[PDB]
């Protein structure tokens, strides 16, 4: 059946091109033990997108596993800011990012993203080169608005999980995650400062897809 | 067909919203079909992903292996600045003329060149000229020879250049080390060269959509 084929192909790509290496396997062992609820080859796609963009500063909205792939793209004077909900989640991420050789570039902020983002914006930080959004889809548009406030021309915004199992095409959906995904894609389309696309994927995470948007 | 219909519906949504086709792109498909090139239920939204990858990279010089009717070529060429250059290889002189007409309609004839002949001969002919390196090489031709196309891409790029290899999933056949399909063997050899070459950092991902179940590889050139 189809999921087994997708797993087999993703395992083949992962072991050849983008292996689940010792820092990444340890991160998963630590997350499991801590009671937290992957596609290394898509993680490596994210790493390569940041590297091609020439990113020095990355913001992640929505432990530490996509965060390790993003962090791996950065130079030594780089900065990666990410969010964890509470101290325990932050500790798991920080230890996993340190083990991945990223603790001098990684800063994990503690709290709900909806509280931590206005605090961060109100500090008036230097703009980010890439914002990766993989959070609650209900607030995806809001997260893209914060991304616009916190980027500069030429920055990249990446939105994960925009297919909703095919549900994203339902204009009549009541589901808050479908509505927030559709509104975020519509914001990318209509905003004069954003040019984007979205693509469907399959693999070890099942059927989904991602959106990319470049700030003009 | 029912799973293809879902993939078609989601790609139509993404295309209509984020990546719509203008007249030059739809004309290019009409001309390609009328010339007897295989009808491909193209994904404008994957074409835009190629365009954005080039723009993100800062590409000025693009090399394409496998023009067909110039559909991907138009997406790639639209990433370039006015003094950019796109060179595309097509084996078939009739397909090459279709691609050049399609590129001229898109207003890309001033920055693009479509070279005729088998890519195993056109690559060394371009190499003979000692060209300025290319920023992005898009390989979407015959997979038997994709390892040799990656070898030539290494000789025609510089650090920070991007190599993109289309159609690397092979229906899921790419995992079969015992495949009798020579196009699977060539795909595997080309992915192994990306993985093993110390100047390349790459990945590959599986896609679905209006083209069906497939996938692509991306590799960055390192120092």
Automatic annotation (TrEMBL), chain B:
InterPro entries noted in UniProt: Cation-dep_OMT, SAM-dependent_MTases_sf, SAM_O-MeTrfase
Coiled-coil intervals = none
Matching entries from Pfam families are given as: Methyltransf_3 (PF01596)
A GO biological-process term: methylation
Per its record, how is this protein called by name? O-methyltransferase
Q: Where along this sequence does the record place binding of Mg(2+)?
A: 140, 166-167
Sorted alphabetically, the keyword list is:
Metal-binding, Methyltransferase, S-adenosyl-L-methionine, Transferase
The entry marks the following residues as binding S-adenosyl-L-homocysteine, namely 42, 68, 72, 90, 95, 119, 142
Entries under SUPFAM superfamilies matching the protein: S-adenosyl-L-methionine-dependent methyltransferases (SSF53335)
Keyword S-adenosyl-L-methionine in annotation: yes
Its Gene Ontology molecular function terms? metal ion binding; O-methyltransferase activity; S-adenosylmethionine-dependent methyltransferase activity
């Amino acid at each position: 059946e189809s999921q087994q084929l997708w797993d087999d192909v993703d395992d083949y790509f992962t072991t050849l091109l983008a292996p689940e290496d010792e820092a990444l396997t340890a991160a998963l062992r630590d997350s499991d033990a801590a009671g937290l609820p992957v596609a290394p080859n898509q993680g490596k796609l994210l790493q390569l997108l940041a590297e091609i963009q020439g990113a020095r500063r990355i913001l992640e909205i929505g432990g530490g596993y996509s965060t390790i792939w993003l962090g791996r793209a950065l130079p030594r004077d780089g900065r990666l800011i990410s969010f964890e909900y509470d101290a325990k989640h932050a500790e798991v991420a920080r230890r996993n990012l340190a083990r991945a050789g990223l603790d001098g570039i990684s800063e994990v902020r503690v709290g709900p993203a909806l509280e931590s983002l206005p605090k961060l914006a109100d500090e008036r930080p230097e703009p980010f080169d890439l914002v990766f959004i993989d959070a609650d889809k209900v607030n995806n548009p809001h997260y893209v608005e914060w991304a616009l406030k916190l980027t500069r021309p030429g920055s990249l915004i990446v939105v994960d999980n925009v297919v909703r199992g095919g549900g994203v095409t339902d204009a009549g959906s009541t589901d808050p995650s479908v509505r927030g995904t559709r509104s975020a894609l519509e914001l990318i389309a209509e905003h004069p400062k954003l040019s984007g696309t979205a693509v469907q994927t399959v693999g070890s995470k099942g059927y989904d897809g991602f959106a990319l948007a470049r700030v003009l």
